[PDB]
Design a protein around this ligand. Structure first.
Ligand SMILES: O=S(=O)(O)c1cccc2cccc(Nc3ccccc3)c12
Ligand SMILES: O=S(=O)(O)c1cccc2cccc(Nc3ccccc3)c12
Ligand SMILES: [Cl-]
Lengths: 131, 131
């Protein structure tokens, strides 16, 4: 869980627009959201993990305990129920809302942090490099 | 509870340095936080209340349900236990950490939003205004 700690900055994005479309994000919002190069800031305090995301589009921050369900207001304004687990050495986040569900996998690969967001077969890959 | 929704700009601050000195904030970071003019954005989505404070010092965000205890990592990086209730029409917040406790009271006084931070005697008062 300590391998993800640090300040990462986006360097690559693929299929992010197809992914946002599937989750239901609006046309104009997908536009400005895709133009953003957010910075992910991960921190830990005891058994509490913090994932802060900062960008021009919107700033978000979720604090959680591994394996314990929590309420989350996503950047695109969805009120979802989240659950984050340390699965296969990767932080795997599942978001459930309105009968639908999406998985956000954050894994380490060498000097980078790969973020795979999936929704009904559509997959978006965003690569982060430590700032 | 609906009387708090909206973006709020800080227009006044009194005895904030004294309050931070009491909560244990360091001299250096205490002068950096004293120069910031935060933008408190309150929003609601069902039974979830979100309070997002944006500034140059640090961007924080807390989502919570009234009367239900939750874990919080403050702007000055304190790992506290918070409980926010609607007491006397005001949004009263009590943070507890290491046997210590401080109350932050958010109330509406006309066209403005007043915030009273108290920590063993000393009281800070920061007044906001719709942005
Ligand atoms: O905050 S943004 O990226 O703008 C964002 C914008 C719009 C919709 C989003 C939906 C899910 C996750 C995001 N965050 C995210 C962040 C990094 C990697 C993968 C997903 C969303
Ligand atoms: O985020 S800051 O103000 O920088 C902040 C900085 C340093 C220490 C703080 C302690 C308690 C509450 C804050 N927030 C707060 C914000 C607005 C009104 C009342 C309290 C603190
Ligand atoms: Cl590394």
């Amino acid at each position: 869980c300590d391998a993800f700690v640090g300040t990462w900055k986006l360097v690559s994005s693929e299929n992010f627009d197809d992914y946002m479309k599937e989750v239901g994000v609006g046309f104009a919002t997908r536009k400005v959201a895709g133009m953003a190069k957010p910075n992910m800031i991960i921190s830990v305090n005891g058994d509490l993990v913090t994932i802060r995301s900062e960008s021009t589009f919107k700033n978000t921050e979720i604090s959680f305990k591994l394996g314990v369900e929590f309420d989350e207001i996503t950047a695109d304004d969805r009120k979802v129920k989240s659950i984050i687990t340390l699965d296969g050495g990767a932080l795997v986040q599942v978001q459930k809302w309105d009968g639908k569900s999406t998985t956000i996998k954050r894994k380490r690969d060498g000097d980078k942090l790969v973020v795979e967001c999936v929704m009904k077969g559509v997959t978006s890959t965003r690569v982060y490099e430590r700032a």
